[PDB]
Design a protein around this nucleic acid. Structure first.
Ligand SMILES: [Zn+2]
Lengths: 142, 192, 59, 142, 76, 65, 62, 100
RNA sequence: ACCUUUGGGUUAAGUCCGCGAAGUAGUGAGAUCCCUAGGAUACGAAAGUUAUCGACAGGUGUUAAAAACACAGGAAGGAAGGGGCAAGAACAGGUCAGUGAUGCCCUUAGAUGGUAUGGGCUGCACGCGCACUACAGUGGUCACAGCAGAAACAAAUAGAAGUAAAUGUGAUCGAGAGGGAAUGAGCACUGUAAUGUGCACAGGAACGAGGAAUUGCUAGUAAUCGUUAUCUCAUUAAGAAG
């Protein structure tokens, strides 16, 4: 069954984030404490653990993609998902992508842990990454 | 989720046993039409008295989409008034709906100033307002009082809505809308 | 303005004098008769003719 | 085969499709989320409104899945409300006696005709010599 | 005079005595009756709602509303 | 024509060749009248807005709406 | 002070004033024999009830 | 066995006549005959100012050319394809074929 | 030489109804297309597409005729909505810098004809016309979701075009933490050439809602918000047309 849809996103993304950090499965980019997520953003994130909320939300994008049986997700797709409206002085605001470097690092970390498999046209889940999510949800709803 | 009963406003408020309490106004104030959320797209504006059949709190949220920058933001208006009803229901202790009804009743001016002179110079005189125009002006004044009050003041906008509406229902000098109703009626009398 | 125009009133007047007994109080009968007898090349016109003819037939 | 009907509902450029089916329990899903999980409350208010003018005993033993594309957040809620409204009447006409269909239809028609008929209203095309459908550019004299 | 960034002991004492018998109270009241800034009206209000001295009655987006000892709702 | 230019490297002794890209008005002259301005370039027409309107009905364009 | 008379509109006659803003109307008072002629400025329907400040001031032109 | 025949044309009356003619031919041979499929018309458009100079109220015109099209998918033997292709000439309609 | 005759009602329209020394046929309007909205009994086994149909002031109510509103049902209701086409007569209205459309005057190897390398059209005391960001809290910032008209997207370890944005939830900031003008040492891209564009770090001007005047707009309209596999286009949109 499509088990992921049974719980609310603003409870799931915070929940997994702790399981990640307590096992260090993803490691921060150099200068994560001062870098911005996009050229469209005004200031760096208010939470020091923003890198882990990215990791938690990336696995959610992949779980729902797997649930709906879509084509595999690309680095471009993820960059447009996290995009925003950039401020340009005296000109209309304009839609701009997220920066790729963060996303590339997360996907390469998850590859080394065996959580994400690279296909010829995108990235895909693996059995361990599915079962972690399954066993979390089964407690979390109860 | 919250209820499986009959239709209540914001799923909270009774929607029954409502009195207008001015026979001059009776036919022109819709408190009949049971709606869960103050939103409808009913296309009555293309009709001769169709804007008098739109429900009361609907007319009241439309009044908020103003000052230019807020045009079209009808969700924002609903968010604002929802909160105001919580403040008012608490403060007053009675269906927010009867506060809104009584605010309208008091805040419409009964006599007005107009040019009458046709075959010469235009000389100002007092004149008597119709039922429909009387309520149109009531909403206008209640809205204008709220907007200008909040502009560069630290207080929250839903709170200012509760301040004005209570006072208006109670016919107190404290209401911007009530004062300006006195002014118009005094000038009308001056030109009588 | 919903005024019928010259050819529509003229054809209406001629048909009631030419075929009077064939006509009735009913729009659909009258529409059938003008569909049957006339050369009129659009339903847009013959809807208007049969409208005027059934407006006359009462009077 | 299991008893089923399908209906379509439209508002502006939003289109929605509802499938309705026999069940041991009343169930309703929109965007794969139940009413107690779905993220927009205007949609939830517009659903529980129509569910109360129809008697609860008429929605018993029945299941719904709503899918939609096009338009925007307010327009899709009304599109969904029509699709839902037409499903119950369609099912009653097909699988019960026709008097109950007529009874339910009188109640919905007394409340809001726009629950069972679609508004033919759409945006008007822009003409030249103005910013929009009717507004003109500013003429000048001296 | 400008607003303040402390709730000193004697302001704290009298606020407890004042919050009873008040009905609905909000961020502004603490900041427009007494001299506190918005950033210290939040912190004090949140504290009293943990102490069971006040009770929260709404918290939708950032708009947040509270009640004191002489509140009483409608009845059916 | 795709013209070519010689250029020297920093040594001012070795030479290489680079190609000039065809861009701007210089090669997009109106096929009816040699004009450089108001040329419609869509659908691989290369005809100016003045010439277009007299020939449009011969080509097969119509004003429906 | 809040003196008031309630009157019932029986007829409307003429669109009147610069720009045609007013309507000449005939009104009968609810608890007196008096019947007046008045100008009123909002939209008005026959059988409306209107609240007057004076029972005497009149628009004789009718 | 199968053939798909695309009749493509920037004139509606011609395409209507030629398709009615070919439909008649199909039903006269009676191989379980059927109507053509009406395709989404291709529409190429240009928008330009009317005046040859800057003077006056700027008035604009939209010209659009419509390429209508109709598809027959059909069952025939190879001889009947080869022989019937004699029908597919001396038309302002352009005619194209697909086969499997 | 000229007039066809008494100027009373109606429509968007001599569009029509009365009456007449007048009466009969036509052009223009109108009717007559095209797009958008509803409709299989047709076609397909894929799940859509197209459709000779549907609305007439027809019904009721308004006491000459012609029209009309206001209700009601209806996907559509008074020219169904929006375009497109569109009399006669005129004007010394604009364009000879669109034209191998053109009369007449002028120049024509030291050219008023071509080409190349550079410079200007982009200069700056100053008066005017039309646009864009603003003057904050119905705001700023951080994250996270999530939806168009439909369907196109090598890679990238700070960063150097792209598949909405307003918007929805939680945090944060607190009344020039709004605003981004002139300017510095850099780091890249397009290009034959930077003078043009992107990026990072600074820097931080006026402006705190506008005198006399003045411009559009009746419903999915005005205003808001993005977006253009639309036009300009090597690179350049704060312009038009959607
Ligand atoms: Zn040309």
């Amino acid at each position: 069954n499509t088990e992921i849809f049974k719980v609310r996103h603003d409870t799931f993304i915070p929940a997994l984030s702790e399981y990640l950090r307590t096992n260090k499965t993803v490691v921060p980019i150099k200068n994560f404490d001062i870098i911005k997520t996009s050229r469209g953003k005004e200031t760096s994130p208010l939470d020091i653990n923003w890198y882990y909320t990215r990791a938690a939300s990336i696995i959610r994008k992949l779980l729902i993609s797997k649930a709906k049986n879509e084509k595999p997700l690309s680095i471009v797709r993820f960059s447009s998902e996290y995009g925003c409206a950039k401020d340009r002085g005296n000109r209309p605001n304009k839609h701009v992508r997220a920066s790729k470097g963060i996303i590339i690092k997360i996907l390469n970390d998850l590859q080394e842990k065996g959580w994400v498999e690279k296909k010829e046209n995108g990235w895909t889940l693996k059995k361990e990454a599915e079962e972690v999510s399954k066993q979390l949800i089964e407690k979390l709803i109860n | 989720t919250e209820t499986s009963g009959d239709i209540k406003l914001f799923g909270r408020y009774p929607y029954t046993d409502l009195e207008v309490k001015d026979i001059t106004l009776e036919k022109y104030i819709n408190v009949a039409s049971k709606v869960i959320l103050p939103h409808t797209s009913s296309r009555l504006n293309t009709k001769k008295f169709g804007r008098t059949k739109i429900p009361v709190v609907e007319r009241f949220v439309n009044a908020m989409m103003r000052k230019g920058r807020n045009n079209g933001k009808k969700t924002l208006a609903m968010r604002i008034v929802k909160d105001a009803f919580f403040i008012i229901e608490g403060v007053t202790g009675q269906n927010p709906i009867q506060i809104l009804v009584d605010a309208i009743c008091n805040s419409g001016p009964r006599e007005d100033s107009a040019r009458i002179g046709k075959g010469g110079v235009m000389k100002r005189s007092s004149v008597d307002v119709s039922p429909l125009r009387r309520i149109n002006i009531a909403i206008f004044l209640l809205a204008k009082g709220v907007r200008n009050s909040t502009f560069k003041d630290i207080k929250m906008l839903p709170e200012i809505i509760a301040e004005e509406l209570i006072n208006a229902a109670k016919n107190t000098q404290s209401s911007f809308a009530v004062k300006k109703k006195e002014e118009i009626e005094r000038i009308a009398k001056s030109n009588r | 303005g919903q005024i019928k125009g010259k050819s529509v009133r003229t054809a209406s007047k001629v048909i009631v004098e030419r075929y009077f007994n064939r006509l009735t109080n009913d729009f659909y009968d009258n529409r059938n008769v003008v569909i049957d007898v006339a050369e009129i090349r659009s339903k847009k016109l013959r809807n208007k003719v049969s409208g005027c003819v059934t407006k006359l037939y009462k009077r | 085969s299991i008893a089923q009907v399908i209906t379509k509902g439209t508002r502006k450029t939003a289109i929605s499709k509802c499938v309705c089916s026999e069940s041991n329990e009343f169930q309703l899903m929109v965007d794969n989320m139940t009413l107690d999980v779905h993220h927009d409350n205007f949609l939830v208010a517009k659903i529980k409104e129509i569910m109360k003018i129809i008697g609860y005993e008429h929605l018993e033993n029945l299941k719904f899945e709503l899918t939609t594309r096009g338009g925007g957040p307010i327009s899709r809620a009304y599109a969904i409300r029509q699709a839902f409204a037409k499903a119950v009447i369609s099912y009653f006409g097909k699988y019960y006696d026709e008097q109950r269909k007529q009874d339910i239809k009188e109640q919905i028609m007394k409340f809001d005709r726009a629950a069972l008929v679609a508004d033919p209203r759409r945006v008007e095309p822009k003409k030249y010599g103005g910013p929009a459908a009717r507004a003109k550019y500013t003429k000048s004299y001296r | 005079v400008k607003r303040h960034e402390r709730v000193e002991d004697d302001i704290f004492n009298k606020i407890v005595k004042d919050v009873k018998n008040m009905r609905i109270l909000t961020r502004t009241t603490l900041s427009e009756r007494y001299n506190l800034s918005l950033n210290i009206s939040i912190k004090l209000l949140r504290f009293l709602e943990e102490n069971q001295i006040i009770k929260l009655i709404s918290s939708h987006r950032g708009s947040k509303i509270y009640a004191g000892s002489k509140y009483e709702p409608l009845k059916v | 024509m795709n013209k070519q230019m010689i250029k020297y490297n920093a040594d001012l002794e070795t030479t290489f060749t680079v190609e000039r890209k065809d861009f701007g008005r210089t090669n997009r002259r109106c096929r009816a009248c040699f004009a450089y301005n108001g040329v419609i370039r869509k659908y691989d027409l290369m005809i100016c807005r003045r010439c277009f309107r007299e020939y449009a009905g011969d080509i097969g364009f119509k004003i429906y709406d | 002070s809040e003196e008031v008379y309630i009157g019932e509109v029986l007829q409307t006659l003429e669109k009147t004033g610069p720009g045609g803003g007013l309507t000449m109307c005939q009104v009968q008072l609810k608890d007196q024999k008096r019947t007046l002629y008045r100008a009123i400025m909002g939209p008005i329907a026959v059988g409306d009830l209107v609240a007057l400040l004076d029972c005497e001031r009149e628009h004789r032109r009718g | 066995i199968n053939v798909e025949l695309r009749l493509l044309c920037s004139n509606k009356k011609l395409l209507s006549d030629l398709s009615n003619r070919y439909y008649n031919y199909l039903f006269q041979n009676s191989p379980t005959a059927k109507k053509p499929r009406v395709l989404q018309p291709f529409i190429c458009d240009v928008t330009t100012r009317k005046s040859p100079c800057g003077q006056g109220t700027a008035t604009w015109s939209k010209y659009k050319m419509i390429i209508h099209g109709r598809m027959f998918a059909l069952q025939m033997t190879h001889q009947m394809l080869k022989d019937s292709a004699a029908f597919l000439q001396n038309t302002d309609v352009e005619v194209r074929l697909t086969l499997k």
